[PDB]
Amino acid sequence: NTEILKSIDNEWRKTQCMPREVAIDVGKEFGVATNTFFKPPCVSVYRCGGCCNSEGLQCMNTSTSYLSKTLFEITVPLSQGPKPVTISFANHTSCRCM
Amino acid sequence: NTEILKSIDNEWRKTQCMPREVAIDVGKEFGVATNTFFKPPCVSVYRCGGCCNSEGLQCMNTSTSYLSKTLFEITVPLSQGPKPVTISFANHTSCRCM
Amino acid sequence: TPPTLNITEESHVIDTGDSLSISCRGQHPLEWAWPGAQEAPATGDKDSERPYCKVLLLHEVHANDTGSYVCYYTAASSYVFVRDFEQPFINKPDTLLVNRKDAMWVPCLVSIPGLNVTLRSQSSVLWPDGQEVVWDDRRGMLVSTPLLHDALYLQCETTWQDFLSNPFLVHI
Amino acid sequence: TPPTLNITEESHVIDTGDSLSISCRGQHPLEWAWPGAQEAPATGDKDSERPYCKVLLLHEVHANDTGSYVCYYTAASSYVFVRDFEQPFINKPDTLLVNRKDAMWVPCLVSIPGLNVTLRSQSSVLWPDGQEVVWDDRRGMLVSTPLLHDALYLQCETTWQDFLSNPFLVHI
Numbered sequence A, B: 001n002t003e004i005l006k007s008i009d010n011e012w013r014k015t016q017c018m019p020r021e022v023a024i025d026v027g028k029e030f031g032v033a034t035n036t037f038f039k040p041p042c043v044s045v046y047r048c049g050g051c052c053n054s055e056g057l058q059c060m061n062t063s064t065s066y067l068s069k070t071l072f073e074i075t076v077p078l079s080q081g082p083k084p085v086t087i088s089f090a091n092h093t094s095c096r097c098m
Numbered sequence C, D: 001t002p003p004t005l006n007i008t009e010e011s012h013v014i015d016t017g018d019s020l021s022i023s024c025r026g027q028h029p030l031e032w033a034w035p036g037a038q039e040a041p042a043t044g045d046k047d048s049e050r051p052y053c054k055v056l057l058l059h060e061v062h063a064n065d066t067g068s069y070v071c072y073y074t075a076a077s078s079y080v081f082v083r084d085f086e087q088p089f090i091n092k093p094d095t096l097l098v099n100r101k102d103a104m105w106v107p108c109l110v111s112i113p114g115l116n117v118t119l120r121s122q123s124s125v126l127w128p129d130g131q132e133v134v135w136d137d138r139r140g141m142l143v144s145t146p147l148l149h150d151a152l153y154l155q156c157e158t159t160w161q162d163f164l165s166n167p168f169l170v171h172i
């Protein structure tokens, strides 16, 4: 009754659409050659995510910041060593079911 | 150099495989009839997730707890009203790339 | 052709636990349409006076008896509000759906004709001023569909010691 | 058939900035295989004594000169450790791969023959005791592949004011 509607509403609140820290696979994020390793392979950024209460509505970003991160890229064969690369990743700052 | 390896290592640490709060769509989680609405449609639980440094290795649970949650289920047509249902959801407590 | 009641008003203010008895008398054999049953004696007493009469009476009247009362043989309608203190609010409960037609009405029925009352939910509170969203004592509040789509459940909030009805919401 | 040096030892302890000069003398015309260049005069001086002689000399010797020294015409090998204080550690740097063969060796070369030294990374520190994982002054430490698969990078840690080499790791 009371307490159950309370908790249920809390579950809704807790499960609502919003930006969340996720691990993005860099290679898969820019779609590079199948001969590259990234180190680290993934980066933690915030992206819009969660569940909408309709199906035809999908959680999308309405505003995005950009984060500079630096990591290393190994190519094959080992012609050269790991080179430093600077990359900008999306950091979603607001979301809406659209 | 120093500070960059430092941060990169921090990115790795931050992006490592572990249990994370996610929103699970209940209907899609048990695969019910395409004529049911769940309220709320989704629940927040922790599931093993993140990125492995190999491809053939995939993040899986090595131990799972179970959480009782109660919510409402609407059927169609509106023959009866929303009925209370108790459901157990997996709460992953440890993970390994397997 | 149209019949008439013993009380020519479209809105009667009654208190709970008060005995109510009205005579609908007009021409043909008549029959009341008072919502439900029971504990209320239904006796069709003729009177002549220039018409056939029919009286409706009820001794025990509380909240679950407030509603509309029609005496159809050109029908004759009259609404009656029965004021209660314990349960001023009547829910569905848990019955609410909607179709995209810009018209979404909430069925949260009010015991008292004049109240300052607001509808609240998970998505803040929704104040009625009359242009986009409008309150109506007759049954509840009226809201446009695509704006309330954002909310998942709804519950009417009052100003008294507070009382909250609780229907839900499913969009189409 | 096999030649011989002016110093019959498989391991020489030298300090940095110290001038080093050894005579490999044995039979046929010979040639040293000292790692790289330069600032070290290469002169093949005969001596007879019962063989043709060849001397290798070097005035400025630091860390980037420590290594193995062979005089092949049945070869004649001798390793020389040149102790430095500023840069006791030599990295690849950033060169490390592996194939599944249970043998994964780390190339972090040590200036000093006897050290207590441990390899650390993101996944704690890895202590060498000799059965599963084993340390070797000649070049570095030996670890089985499927256990180090868990780690992403590696860096040798010492006990002195600390020094950390830094290769990486990519599995196959």
Ligand SMILES: *[C@@H]1O[C@H](CO)[C@@H](O[C@@H]2O[C@H](CO)[C@@H](O)[C@H](O)[C@H]2NC(C)=O)[C@H](O)[C@H]1NC(C)=O
Pocket: A019, A020, A046, A065, A066, A067, A091, A092, A093
């Ligand atoms: C990256 O996105 C996150 C969003 O999760 C930002 O963190 C905060 O997000 C909340 C949303 O609830 C905002 O109200 C805050 O203003 C954000 N910053 C903080 C910590 O106060 C984060 O700022 C974003 N990073 C950037 C600057 O790109």
Ligand SMILES: *[C@@H]1O[C@H](CO)[C@@H](O[C@@H]2O[C@H](CO)[C@@H](O)[C@H](O)[C@H]2NC(C)=O)[C@H](O)[C@H]1NC(C)=O
Pocket: B019, B020, B046, B065, B066, B067, B091, B092, B093
């Ligand atoms: C559901 O899973 C989470 C895991 O995210 C549990 O929360 C804590 O997880 C950490 C892992 O870093 C453990 O060390 C803690 O012991 C866990 N509990 C806390 C808050 O101390 C959570 O306990 C799980 N819920 C249950 C009991 O099923």
Ligand SMILES: *[C@@H]1O[C@H](CO)[C@@H](O)[C@H](O)[C@H]1NC(C)=O
Pocket: A061, A062, A063, A064, A090
């Ligand atoms: C999210 O929306 C903003 C709106 O300006 C846009 O700039 C950004 O590129 C979007 N994020 C995506 C699709 O990567």
Ligand SMILES: *[C@@H]1O[C@H](CO)[C@@H](O)[C@H](O)[C@H]1NC(C)=O
Pocket: B061, B062, B063, B064, B090
């Ligand atoms: C995860 O692993 C545990 C091991 O006991 C198992 O009981 C549990 O069912 C697994 N979780 C899944 C696959 O839902």
Ligand SMILES: *[C@@H]1O[C@H](CO)[C@@H](O)[C@H](O)[C@H]1NC(C)=O
Pocket: C006, C007, C008, C021, C022, C023, C055
């Ligand atoms: C008839 O109606 C009047 C109000 O107009 C009411 O006061 C009276 O009690 C009614 N008579 C009965 C009980 O039939």
Ligand SMILES: *[C@@H]1O[C@H](CO)[C@@H](O)[C@H](O)[C@H]1NC(C)=O
Pocket: C062, C063, C064
């Ligand atoms: C209203 O309806 C129910 C029907 O069983 C009844 O039990 C309840 O007592 C009624 N409310 C009153 C008279 O206060």
Ligand SMILES: *[C@@H]1O[C@H](CO)[C@@H](O)[C@H](O)[C@H]1NC(C)=O
Pocket: C115, C116
């Ligand atoms: C209800 O609110 C309105 C707002 O204008 C106010 O005028 C009225 O006096 C209020 N009713 C009360 C508190 O009696």
Ligand SMILES: *[C@@H]1O[C@H](CO)[C@@H](O)[C@H](O)[C@H]1NC(C)=O
Pocket: D006, D007, D008, D021, D022, D023, D055
């Ligand atoms: C020959 O070797 C000895 C060590 O056995 C060394 O002390 C000496 O300097 C060398 N002679 C030279 C410089 O040719």
Ligand SMILES: *[C@@H]1O[C@H](CO)[C@@H](O)[C@H](O)[C@H]1NC(C)=O
Pocket: D062, D063, D064
């Ligand atoms: C070792 O090698 C590099 C090669 O350019 C040289 O510049 C450096 O000074 C050397 N280290 C010494 C002699 O301390």
Ligand SMILES: *[C@@H]1O[C@H](CO)[C@@H](O)[C@H](O)[C@H]1NC(C)=O
Pocket: D115, D116
């Ligand atoms: C290095 O560690 C070993 C551990 O047994 C110890 O015996 C030895 O004395 C240490 N070397 C030092 C501190 O001189």
